[PDB]
Structure formats: C-alpha cells, structure tokens
Amino acid sequence: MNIVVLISGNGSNLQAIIDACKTNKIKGTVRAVFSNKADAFGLERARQAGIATHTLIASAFDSREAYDRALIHEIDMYAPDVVVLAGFMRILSPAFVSHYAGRLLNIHPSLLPKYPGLHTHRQALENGDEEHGTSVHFVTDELDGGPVILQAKVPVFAGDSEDDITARVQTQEHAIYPLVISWFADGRLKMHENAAWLDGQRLPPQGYA
Amino acid sequence: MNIVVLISGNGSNLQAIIDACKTNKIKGTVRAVFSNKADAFGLERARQAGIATHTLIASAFDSREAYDRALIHEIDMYAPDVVVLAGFMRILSPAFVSHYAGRLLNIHPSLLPKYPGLHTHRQALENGDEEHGTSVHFVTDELDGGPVILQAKVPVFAGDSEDDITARVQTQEHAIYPLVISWFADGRLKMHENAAWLDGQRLPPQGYA
C-alpha cells in the first residue's frame, strides 16, 4: 500500500500518518511527501522518518498547468494507491482531481459542508457556533467537493480564545485521518458515484455515524 | 506495495531490496523482516532501515505446524503483496507455500533446476562446472519448486578457491532479485498454471532470456 502525502506547513497530520504506518495501524507506507512550501516543517518530519521529499514551488513554474503536470508526473512515479492531502494549501485543478479519482483523500478543518474556505476556526467563533470539528472526505470534481467519510465533533466554549477550537480540532484530526486511511488500506473504503462506501455500505452525507 | 522478507543470516540480499525500495527502483516498501535465527545480521540491517523485525525460533515452538501458524499469522498482519525469501534456510510446509500462492518469491544459489539443495557452490566446484549462477523463482507446491523468473550466469575458473563462485554469484543476486521484485511491483510479473508470466508473455523453463 503506497501512500503519497501532500503538505504545505507544520505537518502534524503527516506525522500522525507516519506514526500509524510505523506501528502498522495503517498497513502501508508513506512513499513520498510533497510540499508546495520550501520551509514546511513537515519536510523535516518526513526526512527524519526516512521518507523521500519533493518540493514544487509555484514561482518556479511558467504556468499553473506546468506545475500540475510536474506534480502529477512526480507523484505517479511512486505508484500511489492513495494520495492524501494533509494541509496542502494549493487549489487543485479539475484535471488533477480527476486523475486521482477515488484515490484522493483530504482533511478539512470544518464540518463539511461548512466553512469550505480558510480560517474555518475563525468563522466558527464569529458565528458563535456551539460545536465545530473536522472532516475527512474523498476529493472529486462534483458540485460538492466529494463524499465525506468521517467527521469529528468538537465543542466550543464562550471565551474561546481561538485555540482549543484550533488545537481541540487538531487533536481529533490526528485520530480520524489515520483511521480513515487504515480503512482504505484494508480495502474497506471505496468511492463510487460520488459517494463513500464503507464495507459495502453507502455512507450518509456526514460520513460514518 | 507491501513487501515482507524472510531471512536466516547476513541479509546482503535483503539490503539490496531495502536499497532498491529506498531509491524507488522498486515502487514499494519492505514492511517487515522475519528471521528464524536470533543472530542474523539482517535483523540489524532492517532495524537500521527502520523496518520492523520478527524472530521466530523453532526451539520456541511445540511443533512444526505451530511455528508455521505463528509465521503465517504474523506475516499476514502486514497485508503483504509479496513474500520474498532471501536466504531463509527453513523448509517451508506445503500449507505455507499454498497460502502465499503466486506471492512467494525465492532466490536459489544455483541454475534451477540444478543443485536444489545446500552447498550449491560446493557442488559446482566438485563437478568441475564451467558456469554456475543463481535463480529467482516463484515458490509453488508442484513437482518442480515453481517457475523460474530470472537466472544470472557466472563463469567458474579452475583454481576456483570457493570464492568468487560464492562472491561472484552473490554479486549477480543483488542485481536480479530487486529487478524481479520491481517487475512484480509494477504488475508486469504474474504466476499462472505453475508458470511465470512477464508482460503477458509466458516465460520458458529458464526464466526470461
């Protein structure tokens, strides 16, 4: 089971995946880590875990398509069974998404469908939300960003600084992501007709409940 | 692509496989190394490569079947796509071989079918052979030990000490094994009707020529 992870920053989620593979919780290996930021701490985490790293900087390419072509080419060299986005802050092209059909996973710091943008934790506070969270889903080129696989709930308290909305959700992310990937690794999770299927069971819009 | 390697001694061949995966020559990873000898140097090579190791000692089991049951159980925990024997000096049971049907590879220090026993390099000298070698093959429970995939030729010189019959063949082993495994990793090598198939082409008794 070949796993290729895409990051842009710290890589705490990448670490959770690396740790899960190391303990065999996930019956596979992270073959390579791709970063679109030259100073991502995740590049160190990967290097320390003995994982090959590739850094593709936008400013280093002539066009958007040229970047995606290099990204697809280099990723495909690892024959990945699954491509997981773990904090990758680059908008993927429809062509890229299509190329990795039901092999592309992503974790969003929000209760999809909700705050499908940035500063999700910020909007959760403004709106005065009583509960926030994160969502793992399949990435597809449909009206909706693809079927949700698993969501983790987190309660918001009043004087919520910003953090432990931010760090409370991150704690949930480190648990649900490696679990969803282990499911995929075991062959229990599939993507059909823009819908997530766990053990032959179609999952609801909110993922597994 | 999950690879599980079985060894008994030095592990130079294991190293060749580890190195090939590290450079992505083989698009997969060695998930675990199993040894039936507590002092195998390969256990260190694995540990140094960050690979989990398991040591199953015969003297530690009640019967032969008990050993194989533990071996099968522990190996299966890694969901291997291929199980490769690299210097594993234990006679495998027909049940074990059957369990890993066309997923079991082995390297033999001889031109199969030839010297299918031990001290192959020794018999090559006695007989006064003009050429020796090694063979990678699929392991099956048929009259023949299974179809040969690739063989490497080595010339024997007269005052051949024993070595560079022994070290000349080993040099060939470190090259052909990772190549055959990369073929398997790429999905180009299959086993059907006790015969090796490379790129949909049935291979002859001597393997790919």
mmCIF file of all heavy atoms in Angstrom, chain A residues 3 8 11 15 21 25 56 59 64 76 83 105 107 117 126 130 132 141 151 153 180 187 197:
data_model
loop_
_atom_site.group_PDB
_atom_site.id
_atom_site.type_symbol
_atom_site.label_atom_id
_atom_site.label_comp_id
_atom_site.label_asym_id
_atom_site.label_seq_id
_atom_site.Cartn_x
_atom_site.Cartn_y
_atom_site.Cartn_z
ATOM 1 N N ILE A 3 1.455 5.144 -0.075
ATOM 2 C CA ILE A 3 0.806 6.403 0.279
ATOM 3 C C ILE A 3 1.687 7.599 -0.069
ATOM 4 O O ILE A 3 2.877 7.610 0.235
ATOM 5 C CB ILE A 3 0.515 6.483 1.799
ATOM 6 C CG1 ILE A 3 -0.450 5.379 2.217
ATOM 7 C CG2 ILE A 3 -0.075 7.841 2.150
ATOM 8 C CD1 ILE A 3 -0.404 5.072 3.705
ATOM 9 N N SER A 8 1.900 21.595 3.182
ATOM 10 C CA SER A 8 2.301 22.980 2.942
ATOM 11 C C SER A 8 2.940 23.595 4.190
ATOM 12 O O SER A 8 3.701 24.553 4.084
ATOM 13 C CB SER A 8 1.095 23.833 2.528
ATOM 14 O OG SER A 8 0.575 23.428 1.276
ATOM 15 N N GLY A 11 2.846 19.957 9.314
ATOM 16 C CA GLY A 11 2.824 18.523 9.083
ATOM 17 C C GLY A 11 2.485 17.631 10.267
ATOM 18 O O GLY A 11 2.863 16.461 10.288
ATOM 19 N N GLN A 15 2.605 13.556 10.406
ATOM 20 C CA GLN A 15 3.245 12.800 11.472
ATOM 21 C C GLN A 15 2.328 11.702 11.990
ATOM 22 O O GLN A 15 2.768 10.578 12.223
ATOM 23 C CB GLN A 15 3.631 13.734 12.621
ATOM 24 C CG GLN A 15 4.570 13.103 13.640
ATOM 25 C CD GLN A 15 5.901 12.718 13.037
ATOM 26 O OE1 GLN A 15 6.653 13.573 12.574
ATOM 27 N NE2 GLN A 15 6.199 11.426 13.037
ATOM 28 N N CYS A 21 1.682 4.240 10.278
ATOM 29 C CA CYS A 21 2.272 3.277 9.355
ATOM 30 C C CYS A 21 3.400 2.538 10.071
ATOM 31 O O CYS A 21 3.582 1.328 9.905
ATOM 32 C CB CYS A 21 2.844 3.994 8.127
ATOM 33 S SG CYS A 21 1.630 4.549 6.906
ATOM 34 N N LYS A 25 -0.603 0.404 12.139
ATOM 35 C CA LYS A 25 -2.031 0.618 12.354
ATOM 36 C C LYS A 25 -2.596 0.751 10.949
ATOM 37 O O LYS A 25 -3.707 0.313 10.660
ATOM 38 C CB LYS A 25 -2.294 1.898 13.145
ATOM 39 C CG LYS A 25 -3.539 1.812 14.029
ATOM 40 C CD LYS A 25 -4.432 3.035 13.889
ATOM 41 C CE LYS A 25 -5.476 3.081 14.999
ATOM 42 N NZ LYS A 25 -6.808 3.526 14.505
ATOM 43 N N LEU A 56 7.726 21.428 -4.759
ATOM 44 C CA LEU A 56 7.379 22.094 -6.007
ATOM 45 C C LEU A 56 6.864 23.490 -5.673
ATOM 46 O O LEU A 56 5.782 23.648 -5.105
ATOM 47 C CB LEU A 56 6.298 21.315 -6.761
ATOM 48 C CG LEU A 56 6.418 19.805 -6.989
ATOM 49 C CD1 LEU A 56 5.938 19.513 -8.393
ATOM 50 C CD2 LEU A 56 7.840 19.312 -6.800
ATOM 51 N N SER A 59 6.329 29.613 -7.907
ATOM 52 C CA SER A 59 7.189 30.626 -8.502
ATOM 53 C C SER A 59 8.248 30.023 -9.415
ATOM 54 O O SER A 59 8.880 30.733 -10.191
ATOM 55 C CB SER A 59 7.873 31.438 -7.401
ATOM 56 O OG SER A 59 8.979 30.730 -6.867
ATOM 57 N N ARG A 64 0.221 27.496 -14.321
ATOM 58 C CA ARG A 64 -0.462 26.636 -13.367
ATOM 59 C C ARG A 64 -0.480 25.190 -13.851
ATOM 60 O O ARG A 64 -0.281 24.262 -13.067
ATOM 61 C CB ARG A 64 -1.895 27.127 -13.162
ATOM 62 C CG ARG A 64 -2.450 26.853 -11.776
ATOM 63 C CD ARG A 64 -3.675 27.707 -11.488
ATOM 64 N NE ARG A 64 -3.495 28.531 -10.298
ATOM 65 C CZ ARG A 64 -3.473 28.057 -9.057
ATOM 66 N NH1 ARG A 64 -3.622 26.758 -8.837
ATOM 67 N NH2 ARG A 64 -3.295 28.882 -8.034
ATOM 68 N N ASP A 76 3.104 10.170 -9.557
ATOM 69 C CA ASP A 76 2.854 8.901 -10.223
ATOM 70 C C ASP A 76 4.067 7.982 -10.226
ATOM 71 O O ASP A 76 3.931 6.768 -10.365
ATOM 72 C CB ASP A 76 2.376 9.151 -11.653
ATOM 73 C CG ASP A 76 0.894 9.464 -11.717
ATOM 74 O OD1 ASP A 76 0.276 9.598 -10.638
ATOM 75 O OD2 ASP A 76 0.347 9.575 -12.836
ATOM 76 N N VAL A 83 -3.561 9.119 -2.518
ATOM 77 C CA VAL A 83 -2.879 10.399 -2.391
ATOM 78 C C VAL A 83 -3.648 11.150 -1.318
ATOM 79 O O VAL A 83 -4.846 11.400 -1.462
ATOM 80 C CB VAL A 83 -2.918 11.194 -3.714
ATOM 81 C CG1 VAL A 83 -2.323 12.582 -3.510
ATOM 82 C CG2 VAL A 83 -2.151 10.437 -4.790
ATOM 83 N N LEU A 105 -7.717 11.677 -0.946
ATOM 84 C CA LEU A 105 -8.354 11.996 0.332
ATOM 85 C C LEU A 105 -7.913 13.368 0.817
ATOM 86 O O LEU A 105 -6.834 13.850 0.465
ATOM 87 C CB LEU A 105 -7.987 10.958 1.395
ATOM 88 C CG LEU A 105 -8.412 9.511 1.154
ATOM 89 C CD1 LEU A 105 -7.827 8.632 2.254
ATOM 90 C CD2 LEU A 105 -9.934 9.412 1.122
ATOM 91 N N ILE A 107 -8.453 16.293 4.382
ATOM 92 C CA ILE A 107 -8.966 16.600 5.710
ATOM 93 C C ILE A 107 -9.243 18.103 5.747
ATOM 94 O O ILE A 107 -8.375 18.917 5.422
ATOM 95 C CB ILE A 107 -7.953 16.221 6.818
ATOM 96 C CG1 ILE A 107 -8.527 16.575 8.187
ATOM 97 C CG2 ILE A 107 -6.635 16.944 6.609
ATOM 98 C CD1 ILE A 107 -8.577 15.408 9.138
ATOM 99 N N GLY A 117 -13.886 27.136 3.225
ATOM 100 C CA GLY A 117 -12.824 28.050 2.844
ATOM 101 C C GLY A 117 -11.667 28.015 3.826
ATOM 102 O O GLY A 117 -11.285 26.953 4.317
ATOM 103 N N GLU A 126 -16.804 33.545 15.259
ATOM 104 C CA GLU A 126 -17.642 34.684 14.900
ATOM 105 C C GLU A 126 -19.108 34.283 15.013
ATOM 106 O O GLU A 126 -19.865 34.852 15.800
ATOM 107 C CB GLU A 126 -17.368 35.122 13.458
ATOM 108 C CG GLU A 126 -15.992 35.703 13.202
ATOM 109 C CD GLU A 126 -15.717 35.897 11.721
ATOM 110 O OE1 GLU A 126 -16.419 35.275 10.895
ATOM 111 O OE2 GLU A 126 -14.799 36.671 11.382
ATOM 112 N N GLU A 130 -21.727 26.460 18.527
ATOM 113 C CA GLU A 130 -21.684 25.727 19.785
ATOM 114 C C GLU A 130 -20.784 24.505 19.622
ATOM 115 O O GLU A 130 -20.267 23.962 20.602
ATOM 116 C CB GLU A 130 -23.096 25.298 20.205
ATOM 117 C CG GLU A 130 -23.846 26.323 21.066
ATOM 118 C CD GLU A 130 -22.919 27.242 21.851
ATOM 119 O OE1 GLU A 130 -22.114 26.732 22.661
ATOM 120 O OE2 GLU A 130 -22.995 28.474 21.659
ATOM 121 N N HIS A 132 -17.827 22.685 16.634
ATOM 122 C CA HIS A 132 -17.020 22.766 15.422
ATOM 123 C C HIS A 132 -16.444 21.370 15.158
ATOM 124 O O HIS A 132 -16.932 20.384 15.711
ATOM 125 C CB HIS A 132 -15.895 23.787 15.632
ATOM 126 C CG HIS A 132 -15.109 24.094 14.394
ATOM 127 N ND1 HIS A 132 -15.603 23.876 13.128
ATOM 128 C CD2 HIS A 132 -13.866 24.605 14.234
ATOM 129 C CE1 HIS A 132 -14.694 24.243 12.235
ATOM 130 N NE2 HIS A 132 -13.635 24.688 12.883
ATOM 131 N N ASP A 141 -14.531 15.979 -8.550
ATOM 132 C CA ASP A 141 -14.867 17.163 -9.330
ATOM 133 C C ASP A 141 -16.374 17.278 -9.537
ATOM 134 O O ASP A 141 -16.854 17.343 -10.671
ATOM 135 C CB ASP A 141 -14.162 17.115 -10.688
ATOM 136 C CG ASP A 141 -14.075 18.480 -11.350
ATOM 137 O OD1 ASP A 141 -14.360 19.493 -10.676
ATOM 138 O OD2 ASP A 141 -13.720 18.539 -12.547
ATOM 139 N N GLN A 151 -16.304 12.483 10.240
ATOM 140 C CA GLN A 151 -16.222 13.807 10.843
ATOM 141 C C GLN A 151 -16.041 13.650 12.341
ATOM 142 O O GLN A 151 -16.535 12.693 12.934
ATOM 143 C CB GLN A 151 -17.498 14.602 10.590
ATOM 144 C CG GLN A 151 -17.826 14.822 9.135
ATOM 145 C CD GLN A 151 -19.060 15.681 8.961
ATOM 146 O OE1 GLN A 151 -20.014 15.575 9.731
ATOM 147 N NE2 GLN A 151 -19.046 16.538 7.949
ATOM 148 N N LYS A 153 -16.497 15.665 16.022
ATOM 149 C CA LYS A 153 -17.160 16.786 16.675
ATOM 150 C C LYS A 153 -16.325 17.392 17.793
ATOM 151 O O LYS A 153 -15.637 16.681 18.524
ATOM 152 C CB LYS A 153 -18.502 16.331 17.248
ATOM 153 C CG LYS A 153 -19.698 17.073 16.697
ATOM 154 C CD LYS A 153 -20.091 16.526 15.342
ATOM 155 C CE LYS A 153 -19.417 17.306 14.228
ATOM 156 N NZ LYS A 153 -18.625 18.466 14.739
ATOM 157 N N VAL A 180 -9.266 6.590 8.818
ATOM 158 C CA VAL A 180 -9.894 6.539 7.505
ATOM 159 C C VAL A 180 -8.940 5.944 6.477
ATOM 160 O O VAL A 180 -9.363 5.234 5.564
ATOM 161 C CB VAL A 180 -10.321 7.944 7.032
ATOM 162 C CG1 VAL A 180 -10.616 7.930 5.535
ATOM 163 C CG2 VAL A 180 -11.541 8.401 7.812
ATOM 164 N N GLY A 187 -8.939 -2.019 2.376
ATOM 165 C CA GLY A 187 -9.856 -2.298 1.286
ATOM 166 C C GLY A 187 -11.317 -2.216 1.692
ATOM 167 O O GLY A 187 -12.192 -2.698 0.972
ATOM 168 N N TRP A 197 -18.209 4.535 0.380
ATOM 169 C CA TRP A 197 -18.728 3.220 0.731
ATOM 170 C C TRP A 197 -17.807 2.489 1.701
ATOM 171 O O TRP A 197 -16.681 2.134 1.353
ATOM 172 C CB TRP A 197 -18.909 2.370 -0.532
ATOM 173 C CG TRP A 197 -19.966 2.890 -1.470
ATOM 174 C CD1 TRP A 197 -19.854 3.947 -2.321
ATOM 175 C CD2 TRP A 197 -21.302 2.382 -1.611
ATOM 176 N NE1 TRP A 197 -21.041 4.135 -2.992
ATOM 177 C CE2 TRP A 197 -21.936 3.200 -2.590
ATOM 178 C CE3 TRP A 197 -22.017 1.332 -1.036
ATOM 179 C CZ2 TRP A 197 -23.269 2.984 -2.974
ATOM 180 C CZ3 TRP A 197 -23.337 1.121 -1.422
ATOM 181 C CH2 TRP A 197 -23.947 1.947 -2.388
#
